[PDB]
Structure 1
Amino acid sequence: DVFLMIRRHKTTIFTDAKESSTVFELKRIVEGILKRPPDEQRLYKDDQLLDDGKTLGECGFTSQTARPQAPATVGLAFRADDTFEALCIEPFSSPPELPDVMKPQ
């Protein structure tokens, strides 16, 4: 059982899937959520594309690095006029950086 975050720009999908599940099943999930056919989607893991026939465990999504308390980011892009934009995962807001207590004045 593997937990992911599909991060099409500002959207974030907290879906769950099995390791034995294929990438095309994940695209079907995104189809069920974003109403986009699987041919329109291109999934990216760490700026590396995922083949449709590859299983989720094949691409590097194990239940040890994509646990529910820290899911693994999975990029996604949508086809725009017979093309495909690059991944544009916008970063989350930077937390207020707490200063180190041992930093000298």
Structure 2
Amino acid sequence: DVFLMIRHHKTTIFTDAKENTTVYELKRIVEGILKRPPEDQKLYKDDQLLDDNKTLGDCGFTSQTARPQAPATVGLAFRSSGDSFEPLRVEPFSSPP
């Protein structure tokens, strides 16, 4: 069981999945939430692009990291004009005093 926190600029999504989860089901979850075609968005992990075919078994999103009390942070970027994608300019959260 893995808990993921997708962050795409002024948006954040909490998702549930499993270790054998493929990237395509996360991508179609983002489809159902953003109704923007899946080839536009591509997932990341610490400024590193990740591919659709593989599963989260070796992605590093283990149950010890993807946790209900600390979901694994996942980036996301849609498609800009043409076949280009915007950078990972997702803003951080506010700073508690």
Q: TM-score, normalised by structure 1?
A: 0.87
Q: State the match for 1:61 in structure 2.
A: 61
Query: What's the counterpart of residue 94 of structure 1?
Result: 95
Superposition deviation, residue 87 in structure 1 = 1.0
The residue number in structure 2 matching 1:100 is none
4+ residue runs over 6 A deviation: none
Percentage identity across paired residues of the two chains: 84
Alpha-carbon distance, 1:18 to partner: 1.0
**Tell me, which stretches of 5 or more residues in structure 1 are unaligned?**
97-105
Q: Secondary structure at the match of 1:58?
A: coil
Once the two structures are superposed, residues 24-72 of structure 1 have per-residue CA deviations (whole angstroms, 9 ceiling, x without a partner) of 1110110011111211111111111111011012211111111011001
Q: Does 1:77 align with 2:54?
A: no
After TM superposition, list the pairs within 5 Å mapping 1:3-82 onto structure 2: 3-81=3-81, 82=83
CA RMSD of aligned residues (A): 0.9
Provide the rounded CA distance (Å) in 1 between the counterparts of 2:86 and 2:58: 24
CA distance in 2, matches of 1:88, 1:43: 14
Q: Rg bigger for which structure?
A: 1
Structure 2: 5+ residue runs without aligned partners? none
- TM-score calculated relative to the size of structure 2: 0.94
Q: How many residues get paired?
A: 96
Report the Cα distance in structure 2 between the residues aligned to 1:63 and 1:37, rounded to whole angstroms. Answer: 29
Give the Cα separation in 2 of the matches to 1:30 and 1:53: 16
